[PDB]
């Protein structure tokens, strides 16, 4: 068991936020009589919302407003990446601890409840903890000190996650899939 402590990222790592957003974006396009495929919309949103709108909905009246309403509805039932809860469990079964660092406010906590993974986290750091944003290592150094982390892995989907982890003296994993993370961990 290579690491004891796991410092997670939510969006793009545990939470498939682009899936719920894609569902909302595709359904909003349909209101205007427009069909676009899942994979194109998903990739466009991963670039940015302005890119997705300029690409697929540049002159659709009230599109953003309606899209955001549909997205909020989708997020009544957020979607984790496939296999997340089983991986969290396998790690916890070996005595591992899970932490979460987010730049978002305390809505994070609602998402963890709705997806039934709140029980996994020893501590969830949100913006209300007052720390600087990644890639600044402040929040991960706080966790390292408070929880006396000697064997920690920082998992996130973006460069800033890796940079924060490195600057905090922790090993990192650039998340692409749950299966691949399992392969790296032998678990
Ligand atoms: Ca992320």
JSON list of C-alpha atoms and ligand atoms in Angstrom, two decimals:
[
{"chain": "A", "resi": 1, "resn": "UNK", "atom": "CA", "xyz": [0.00, 0.00, 0.00]},
{"chain": "A", "resi": 2, "resn": "UNK", "atom": "CA", "xyz": [2.05, 2.89, -1.40]},
{"chain": "A", "resi": 3, "resn": "UNK", "atom": "CA", "xyz": [0.33, 5.91, 0.20]},
{"chain": "A", "resi": 4, "resn": "UNK", "atom": "CA", "xyz": [-1.58, 6.46, 3.45]},
{"chain": "A", "resi": 5, "resn": "UNK", "atom": "CA", "xyz": [-3.22, 9.81, 2.68]},
{"chain": "A", "resi": 6, "resn": "UNK", "atom": "CA", "xyz": [-5.04, 10.90, -0.46]},
{"chain": "A", "resi": 7, "resn": "UNK", "atom": "CA", "xyz": [-5.75, 14.56, -1.15]},
{"chain": "A", "resi": 8, "resn": "UNK", "atom": "CA", "xyz": [-8.44, 14.75, -3.81]},
{"chain": "A", "resi": 9, "resn": "UNK", "atom": "CA", "xyz": [-9.80, 17.21, -6.30]},
{"chain": "A", "resi": 10, "resn": "UNK", "atom": "CA", "xyz": [-13.59, 17.19, -6.88]},
{"chain": "A", "resi": 11, "resn": "UNK", "atom": "CA", "xyz": [-14.48, 18.42, -10.39]},
{"chain": "A", "resi": 12, "resn": "UNK", "atom": "CA", "xyz": [-12.82, 16.37, -13.13]},
{"chain": "A", "resi": 13, "resn": "UNK", "atom": "CA", "xyz": [-11.40, 13.78, -10.70]},
{"chain": "A", "resi": 14, "resn": "UNK", "atom": "CA", "xyz": [-14.14, 12.46, -8.39]},
{"chain": "A", "resi": 15, "resn": "UNK", "atom": "CA", "xyz": [-17.09, 14.38, -9.86]},
{"chain": "A", "resi": 16, "resn": "UNK", "atom": "CA", "xyz": [-17.84, 14.19, -13.59]},
{"chain": "A", "resi": 17, "resn": "UNK", "atom": "CA", "xyz": [-19.15, 17.76, -13.70]},
{"chain": "A", "resi": 18, "resn": "UNK", "atom": "CA", "xyz": [-18.71, 17.90, -17.47]},
{"chain": "A", "resi": 19, "resn": "UNK", "atom": "CA", "xyz": [-21.24, 15.07, -17.85]},
{"chain": "A", "resi": 20, "resn": "UNK", "atom": "CA", "xyz": [-24.03, 16.91, -16.06]},
{"chain": "A", "resi": 21, "resn": "UNK", "atom": "CA", "xyz": [-23.11, 20.14, -17.88]},
{"chain": "A", "resi": 22, "resn": "UNK", "atom": "CA", "xyz": [-23.08, 18.34, -21.25]},
{"chain": "A", "resi": 23, "resn": "UNK", "atom": "CA", "xyz": [-26.50, 16.84, -20.58]},
{"chain": "A", "resi": 24, "resn": "UNK", "atom": "CA", "xyz": [-27.84, 20.32, -19.77]},
{"chain": "A", "resi": 25, "resn": "UNK", "atom": "CA", "xyz": [-26.09, 21.93, -22.77]},
{"chain": "A", "resi": 26, "resn": "UNK", "atom": "CA", "xyz": [-27.40, 19.33, -25.25]},
{"chain": "A", "resi": 27, "resn": "UNK", "atom": "CA", "xyz": [-30.95, 19.62, -23.88]},
{"chain": "A", "resi": 28, "resn": "UNK", "atom": "CA", "xyz": [-30.78, 23.44, -24.06]},
{"chain": "A", "resi": 29, "resn": "UNK", "atom": "CA", "xyz": [-29.60, 23.27, -27.71]},
{"chain": "A", "resi": 30, "resn": "UNK", "atom": "CA", "xyz": [-32.62, 21.07, -28.48]},
{"chain": "A", "resi": 31, "resn": "UNK", "atom": "CA", "xyz": [-34.95, 23.89, -27.32]},
{"chain": "A", "resi": 32, "resn": "UNK", "atom": "CA", "xyz": [-33.63, 25.87, -30.31]},
{"chain": "A", "resi": 33, "resn": "UNK", "atom": "CA", "xyz": [-34.01, 22.90, -32.70]},
{"chain": "A", "resi": 34, "resn": "UNK", "atom": "CA", "xyz": [-30.28, 22.14, -32.65]},
{"chain": "A", "resi": 35, "resn": "UNK", "atom": "CA", "xyz": [-28.71, 18.70, -32.23]},
{"chain": "A", "resi": 36, "resn": "UNK", "atom": "CA", "xyz": [-25.06, 18.27, -31.24]},
{"chain": "A", "resi": 37, "resn": "UNK", "atom": "CA", "xyz": [-23.32, 15.12, -30.09]},
{"chain": "A", "resi": 38, "resn": "UNK", "atom": "CA", "xyz": [-22.28, 14.35, -26.51]},
{"chain": "A", "resi": 39, "resn": "UNK", "atom": "CA", "xyz": [-18.55, 13.98, -27.08]},
{"chain": "A", "resi": 40, "resn": "UNK", "atom": "CA", "xyz": [-18.16, 17.26, -29.00]},
{"chain": "A", "resi": 41, "resn": "UNK", "atom": "CA", "xyz": [-20.09, 19.25, -26.42]},
{"chain": "A", "resi": 42, "resn": "UNK", "atom": "CA", "xyz": [-18.23, 17.60, -23.52]},
{"chain": "A", "resi": 43, "resn": "UNK", "atom": "CA", "xyz": [-14.84, 18.40, -25.02]},
{"chain": "A", "resi": 44, "resn": "UNK", "atom": "CA", "xyz": [-15.88, 21.97, -25.83]},
{"chain": "A", "resi": 45, "resn": "UNK", "atom": "CA", "xyz": [-17.05, 22.57, -22.24]},
{"chain": "A", "resi": 46, "resn": "UNK", "atom": "CA", "xyz": [-13.72, 21.18, -21.00]},
{"chain": "A", "resi": 47, "resn": "UNK", "atom": "CA", "xyz": [-12.07, 24.01, -22.93]},
{"chain": "A", "resi": 48, "resn": "UNK", "atom": "CA", "xyz": [-14.47, 26.67, -21.56]},
{"chain": "A", "resi": 49, "resn": "UNK", "atom": "CA", "xyz": [-18.11, 27.62, -21.48]},
{"chain": "A", "resi": 50, "resn": "UNK", "atom": "CA", "xyz": [-17.48, 30.65, -23.69]},
{"chain": "A", "resi": 51, "resn": "UNK", "atom": "CA", "xyz": [-15.81, 28.36, -26.27]},
{"chain": "A", "resi": 52, "resn": "UNK", "atom": "CA", "xyz": [-18.74, 25.95, -26.20]},
{"chain": "A", "resi": 53, "resn": "UNK", "atom": "CA", "xyz": [-21.26, 28.79, -26.62]},
{"chain": "A", "resi": 54, "resn": "UNK", "atom": "CA", "xyz": [-19.33, 30.50, -29.41]},
{"chain": "A", "resi": 55, "resn": "UNK", "atom": "CA", "xyz": [-18.99, 27.13, -31.18]},
{"chain": "A", "resi": 56, "resn": "UNK", "atom": "CA", "xyz": [-22.53, 25.77, -30.82]},
{"chain": "A", "resi": 57, "resn": "UNK", "atom": "CA", "xyz": [-24.81, 28.64, -29.66]},
{"chain": "A", "resi": 58, "resn": "UNK", "atom": "CA", "xyz": [-23.29, 32.01, -30.65]},
{"chain": "A", "resi": 59, "resn": "UNK", "atom": "CA", "xyz": [-26.58, 33.80, -31.48]},
{"chain": "A", "resi": 60, "resn": "UNK", "atom": "CA", "xyz": [-29.13, 31.76, -29.55]},
{"chain": "A", "resi": 61, "resn": "UNK", "atom": "CA", "xyz": [-31.19, 34.23, -27.50]},
{"chain": "A", "resi": 62, "resn": "UNK", "atom": "CA", "xyz": [-31.21, 33.62, -23.71]},
{"chain": "A", "resi": 63, "resn": "UNK", "atom": "CA", "xyz": [-29.15, 30.42, -24.18]},
{"chain": "A", "resi": 64, "resn": "UNK", "atom": "CA", "xyz": [-26.75, 30.84, -21.25]},
{"chain": "A", "resi": 65, "resn": "UNK", "atom": "CA", "xyz": [-29.50, 31.63, -18.78]},
{"chain": "A", "resi": 66, "resn": "UNK", "atom": "CA", "xyz": [-31.56, 28.61, -19.82]},
{"chain": "A", "resi": 67, "resn": "UNK", "atom": "CA", "xyz": [-28.45, 26.41, -19.91]},
{"chain": "A", "resi": 68, "resn": "UNK", "atom": "CA", "xyz": [-27.52, 27.38, -16.32]},
{"chain": "A", "resi": 69, "resn": "UNK", "atom": "CA", "xyz": [-31.04, 26.59, -15.13]},
{"chain": "A", "resi": 70, "resn": "UNK", "atom": "CA", "xyz": [-30.89, 23.18, -16.83]},
{"chain": "A", "resi": 71, "resn": "UNK", "atom": "CA", "xyz": [-27.42, 22.58, -15.37]},
{"chain": "A", "resi": 72, "resn": "UNK", "atom": "CA", "xyz": [-28.66, 23.30, -11.83]},
{"chain": "A", "resi": 73, "resn": "UNK", "atom": "CA", "xyz": [-31.43, 20.75, -12.42]},
{"chain": "A", "resi": 74, "resn": "UNK", "atom": "CA", "xyz": [-28.92, 18.13, -13.57]},
{"chain": "A", "resi": 75, "resn": "UNK", "atom": "CA", "xyz": [-26.84, 18.82, -10.45]},
{"chain": "A", "resi": 76, "resn": "UNK", "atom": "CA", "xyz": [-29.78, 17.76, -8.28]},
{"chain": "A", "resi": 77, "resn": "UNK", "atom": "CA", "xyz": [-28.31, 14.34, -9.16]},
{"chain": "A", "resi": 78, "resn": "UNK", "atom": "CA", "xyz": [-24.57, 14.83, -9.67]},
{"chain": "A", "resi": 79, "resn": "UNK", "atom": "CA", "xyz": [-22.60, 12.12, -11.47]},
{"chain": "A", "resi": 80, "resn": "UNK", "atom": "CA", "xyz": [-19.32, 10.71, -10.12]},
{"chain": "A", "resi": 81, "resn": "UNK", "atom": "CA", "xyz": [-16.70, 9.21, -12.40]},
{"chain": "A", "resi": 82, "resn": "UNK", "atom": "CA", "xyz": [-17.34, 5.49, -12.82]},
{"chain": "A", "resi": 83, "resn": "UNK", "atom": "CA", "xyz": [-15.83, 3.48, -9.97]},
{"chain": "A", "resi": 84, "resn": "UNK", "atom": "CA", "xyz": [-15.16, 6.34, -7.54]},
{"chain": "A", "resi": 85, "resn": "UNK", "atom": "CA", "xyz": [-17.00, 5.00, -4.49]},
{"chain": "A", "resi": 86, "resn": "UNK", "atom": "CA", "xyz": [-15.40, 1.54, -4.82]},
{"chain": "A", "resi": 87, "resn": "UNK", "atom": "CA", "xyz": [-11.91, 3.06, -5.01]},
{"chain": "A", "resi": 88, "resn": "UNK", "atom": "CA", "xyz": [-12.51, 5.25, -1.98]},
{"chain": "A", "resi": 89, "resn": "UNK", "atom": "CA", "xyz": [-13.67, 2.12, -0.12]},
{"chain": "A", "resi": 90, "resn": "UNK", "atom": "CA", "xyz": [-10.72, -0.03, -1.14]},
{"chain": "A", "resi": 91, "resn": "UNK", "atom": "CA", "xyz": [-8.35, 2.68, 0.13]},
{"chain": "A", "resi": 92, "resn": "UNK", "atom": "CA", "xyz": [-10.26, 3.22, 3.38]},
{"chain": "A", "resi": 93, "resn": "UNK", "atom": "CA", "xyz": [-10.21, -0.55, 3.95]},
{"chain": "A", "resi": 94, "resn": "UNK", "atom": "CA", "xyz": [-6.40, -0.37, 4.09]},
{"chain": "A", "resi": 95, "resn": "UNK", "atom": "CA", "xyz": [-6.50, 2.38, 6.72]},
{"chain": "A", "resi": 96, "resn": "UNK", "atom": "CA", "xyz": [-6.08, 5.19, 4.19]},
{"chain": "A", "resi": 97, "resn": "UNK", "atom": "CA", "xyz": [-7.45, 8.68, 4.79]},
{"chain": "A", "resi": 98, "resn": "UNK", "atom": "CA", "xyz": [-9.11, 10.94, 2.25]},
{"chain": "A", "resi": 99, "resn": "UNK", "atom": "CA", "xyz": [-9.05, 14.73, 2.13]},
{"chain": "A", "resi": 100, "resn": "UNK", "atom": "CA", "xyz": [-10.62, 17.13, -0.36]},
{"chain": "A", "resi": 101, "resn": "UNK", "atom": "CA", "xyz": [-9.41, 20.57, -1.44]},
{"chain": "A", "resi": 102, "resn": "UNK", "atom": "CA", "xyz": [-11.75, 22.79, -3.42]},
{"chain": "A", "resi": 103, "resn": "UNK", "atom": "CA", "xyz": [-11.82, 26.45, -4.38]},
{"chain": "A", "resi": 104, "resn": "UNK", "atom": "CA", "xyz": [-15.62, 26.37, -4.38]},
{"chain": "A", "resi": 105, "resn": "UNK", "atom": "CA", "xyz": [-17.75, 27.51, -1.46]},
{"chain": "A", "resi": 106, "resn": "UNK", "atom": "CA", "xyz": [-19.72, 25.23, 0.89]},
{"chain": "A", "resi": 107, "resn": "UNK", "atom": "CA", "xyz": [-21.93, 23.90, -2.02]},
{"chain": "A", "resi": 108, "resn": "UNK", "atom": "CA", "xyz": [-19.12, 21.33, -2.27]},
{"chain": "A", "resi": 109, "resn": "UNK", "atom": "CA", "xyz": [-20.55, 19.81, 0.87]},
{"chain": "A", "resi": 110, "resn": "UNK", "atom": "CA", "xyz": [-23.99, 19.35, -0.73]},
{"chain": "A", "resi": 111, "resn": "UNK", "atom": "CA", "xyz": [-22.45, 17.59, -3.71]},
{"chain": "A", "resi": 112, "resn": "UNK", "atom": "CA", "xyz": [-20.63, 15.13, -1.41]},
{"chain": "A", "resi": 113, "resn": "UNK", "atom": "CA", "xyz": [-23.92, 14.36, 0.35]},
{"chain": "A", "resi": 114, "resn": "UNK", "atom": "CA", "xyz": [-25.91, 13.92, -2.86]},
{"chain": "A", "resi": 115, "resn": "UNK", "atom": "CA", "xyz": [-23.26, 11.53, -4.24]},
{"chain": "A", "resi": 116, "resn": "UNK", "atom": "CA", "xyz": [-22.94, 9.66, -0.91]},
{"chain": "A", "resi": 117, "resn": "UNK", "atom": "CA", "xyz": [-19.18, 10.11, -0.56]},
{"chain": "A", "resi": 118, "resn": "UNK", "atom": "CA", "xyz": [-19.15, 12.65, 2.31]},
{"chain": "A", "resi": 119, "resn": "UNK", "atom": "CA", "xyz": [-18.43, 9.81, 4.74]},
{"chain": "A", "resi": 120, "resn": "UNK", "atom": "CA", "xyz": [-15.01, 9.22, 3.16]},
{"chain": "A", "resi": 121, "resn": "UNK", "atom": "CA", "xyz": [-13.39, 12.55, 4.00]},
{"chain": "A", "resi": 122, "resn": "UNK", "atom": "CA", "xyz": [-11.46, 13.25, 7.16]},
{"chain": "A", "resi": 123, "resn": "UNK", "atom": "CA", "xyz": [-11.55, 16.93, 6.20]},
{"chain": "A", "resi": 124, "resn": "UNK", "atom": "CA", "xyz": [-12.98, 18.89, 3.28]},
{"chain": "A", "resi": 125, "resn": "UNK", "atom": "CA", "xyz": [-11.30, 22.25, 2.60]},
{"chain": "A", "resi": 126, "resn": "UNK", "atom": "CA", "xyz": [-13.54, 24.74, 0.76]},
{"chain": "A", "resi": 127, "resn": "UNK", "atom": "CA", "xyz": [-13.06, 28.45, 0.07]},
{"chain": "A", "resi": 128, "resn": "UNK", "atom": "CA", "xyz": [-14.51, 29.19, 3.51]},
{"chain": "A", "resi": 129, "resn": "UNK", "atom": "CA", "xyz": [-11.24, 27.92, 5.08]},
{"chain": "A", "resi": 130, "resn": "UNK", "atom": "CA", "xyz": [-9.65, 31.11, 3.72]},
{"chain": "A", "resi": 131, "resn": "UNK", "atom": "CA", "xyz": [-6.74, 29.58, 1.83]},
{"chain": "A", "resi": 132, "resn": "UNK", "atom": "CA", "xyz": [-5.19, 30.71, -1.43]},
{"chain": "A", "resi": 133, "resn": "UNK", "atom": "CA", "xyz": [-6.09, 28.90, -4.65]},
{"chain": "A", "resi": 134, "resn": "UNK", "atom": "CA", "xyz": [-3.99, 26.15, -6.17]},
{"chain": "A", "resi": 135, "resn": "UNK", "atom": "CA", "xyz": [-1.23, 26.15, -7.40]},
{"chain": "A", "resi": 136, "resn": "UNK", "atom": "CA", "xyz": [-0.34, 27.91, -4.13]},
{"chain": "A", "resi": 137, "resn": "UNK", "atom": "CA", "xyz": [0.50, 25.06, -1.71]},
{"chain": "A", "resi": 138, "resn": "UNK", "atom": "CA", "xyz": [-1.02, 26.79, 1.36]},
{"chain": "A", "resi": 139, "resn": "UNK", "atom": "CA", "xyz": [-4.06, 24.51, 1.74]},
{"chain": "A", "resi": 140, "resn": "UNK", "atom": "CA", "xyz": [-2.12, 21.29, 1.15]},
{"chain": "A", "resi": 141, "resn": "UNK", "atom": "CA", "xyz": [0.61, 22.41, 3.62]},
{"chain": "A", "resi": 142, "resn": "UNK", "atom": "CA", "xyz": [-2.18, 23.09, 6.13]},
{"chain": "A", "resi": 143, "resn": "UNK", "atom": "CA", "xyz": [-3.41, 19.51, 5.71]},
{"chain": "A", "resi": 144, "resn": "UNK", "atom": "CA", "xyz": [0.12, 18.10, 5.83]},
{"chain": "A", "resi": 145, "resn": "UNK", "atom": "CA", "xyz": [0.80, 19.89, 9.13]},
{"chain": "A", "resi": 146, "resn": "UNK", "atom": "CA", "xyz": [-2.59, 19.34, 10.76]},
{"chain": "A", "resi": 147, "resn": "UNK", "atom": "CA", "xyz": [-2.82, 15.66, 9.81]},
{"chain": "A", "resi": 148, "resn": "UNK", "atom": "CA", "xyz": [0.93, 14.99, 9.99]},
{"chain": "A", "resi": 149, "resn": "UNK", "atom": "CA", "xyz": [1.01, 13.54, 6.50]},
{"chain": "A", "resi": 150, "resn": "UNK", "atom": "CA", "xyz": [4.19, 11.55, 5.75]},
{"chain": "A", "resi": 151, "resn": "UNK", "atom": "CA", "xyz": [2.91, 9.38, 2.88]},
{"chain": "A", "resi": 152, "resn": "UNK", "atom": "CA", "xyz": [0.54, 11.46, 0.78]},
{"chain": "A", "resi": 153, "resn": "UNK", "atom": "CA", "xyz": [-0.69, 11.46, -2.80]},
{"chain": "A", "resi": 154, "resn": "UNK", "atom": "CA", "xyz": [-2.32, 14.51, -4.41]},
{"chain": "A", "resi": 155, "resn": "UNK", "atom": "CA", "xyz": [-4.76, 13.57, -7.18]},
{"chain": "A", "resi": 156, "resn": "UNK", "atom": "CA", "xyz": [-6.19, 16.12, -9.61]},
{"chain": "A", "resi": 157, "resn": "UNK", "atom": "CA", "xyz": [-6.94, 16.61, -13.28]},
{"chain": "A", "resi": 158, "resn": "UNK", "atom": "CA", "xyz": [-5.18, 19.95, -13.85]},
{"chain": "A", "resi": 159, "resn": "UNK", "atom": "CA", "xyz": [-1.64, 21.29, -13.88]},
{"chain": "A", "resi": 160, "resn": "UNK", "atom": "CA", "xyz": [-2.40, 23.53, -10.87]},
{"chain": "A", "resi": 161, "resn": "UNK", "atom": "CA", "xyz": [-3.24, 20.44, -8.79]},
{"chain": "A", "resi": 162, "resn": "UNK", "atom": "CA", "xyz": [0.10, 18.85, -9.63]},
{"chain": "A", "resi": 163, "resn": "UNK", "atom": "CA", "xyz": [1.94, 22.11, -8.99]},
{"chain": "A", "resi": 164, "resn": "UNK", "atom": "CA", "xyz": [0.30, 22.57, -5.58]},
{"chain": "A", "resi": 165, "resn": "UNK", "atom": "CA", "xyz": [1.09, 19.00, -4.58]},
{"chain": "A", "resi": 166, "resn": "UNK", "atom": "CA", "xyz": [4.73, 19.27, -5.70]},
{"chain": "A", "resi": 167, "resn": "UNK", "atom": "CA", "xyz": [5.16, 22.59, -3.86]},
{"chain": "A", "resi": 168, "resn": "UNK", "atom": "CA", "xyz": [3.77, 20.95, -0.72]},
{"chain": "A", "resi": 169, "resn": "UNK", "atom": "CA", "xyz": [6.35, 18.14, -0.96]},
{"chain": "A", "resi": 170, "resn": "UNK", "atom": "CA", "xyz": [3.80, 15.46, -1.86]},
{"chain": "A", "resi": 171, "resn": "UNK", "atom": "CA", "xyz": [3.68, 12.93, -4.66]},
{"chain": "A", "resi": 172, "resn": "UNK", "atom": "CA", "xyz": [1.11, 13.63, -7.36]},
{"chain": "A", "resi": 173, "resn": "UNK", "atom": "CA", "xyz": [-1.11, 11.88, -9.87]},
{"chain": "A", "resi": 174, "resn": "UNK", "atom": "CA", "xyz": [-2.51, 13.60, -12.94]},
{"chain": "A", "resi": 175, "resn": "UNK", "atom": "CA", "xyz": [-5.93, 12.00, -13.07]},
{"chain": "A", "resi": 176, "resn": "UNK", "atom": "CA", "xyz": [-7.26, 10.61, -16.33]},
{"chain": "A", "resi": 177, "resn": "UNK", "atom": "CA", "xyz": [-9.42, 7.66, -15.18]},
{"chain": "A", "resi": 178, "resn": "UNK", "atom": "CA", "xyz": [-10.25, 5.60, -12.13]},
{"chain": "A", "resi": 179, "resn": "UNK", "atom": "CA", "xyz": [-9.01, 2.42, -13.86]},
{"chain": "A", "resi": 180, "resn": "UNK", "atom": "CA", "xyz": [-5.64, 4.05, -14.52]},
{"chain": "A", "resi": 181, "resn": "UNK", "atom": "CA", "xyz": [-5.29, 5.30, -10.95]},
{"chain": "A", "resi": 182, "resn": "UNK", "atom": "CA", "xyz": [-6.05, 1.76, -9.73]},
{"chain": "A", "resi": 183, "resn": "UNK", "atom": "CA", "xyz": [-3.34, 0.44, -12.07]},
{"chain": "A", "resi": 184, "resn": "UNK", "atom": "CA", "xyz": [-0.76, 2.85, -10.63]},
{"chain": "A", "resi": 185, "resn": "UNK", "atom": "CA", "xyz": [-1.81, 1.91, -7.06]},
{"chain": "A", "resi": 186, "resn": "UNK", "atom": "CA", "xyz": [-2.11, -1.89, -7.62]},
{"chain": "A", "resi": 187, "resn": "UNK", "atom": "CA", "xyz": [-5.56, -1.73, -5.94]},
{"chain": "B", "resi": 1, "resn": "LIG", "atom": "CA1", "xyz": [-10.42, 19.65, -11.07]}
]
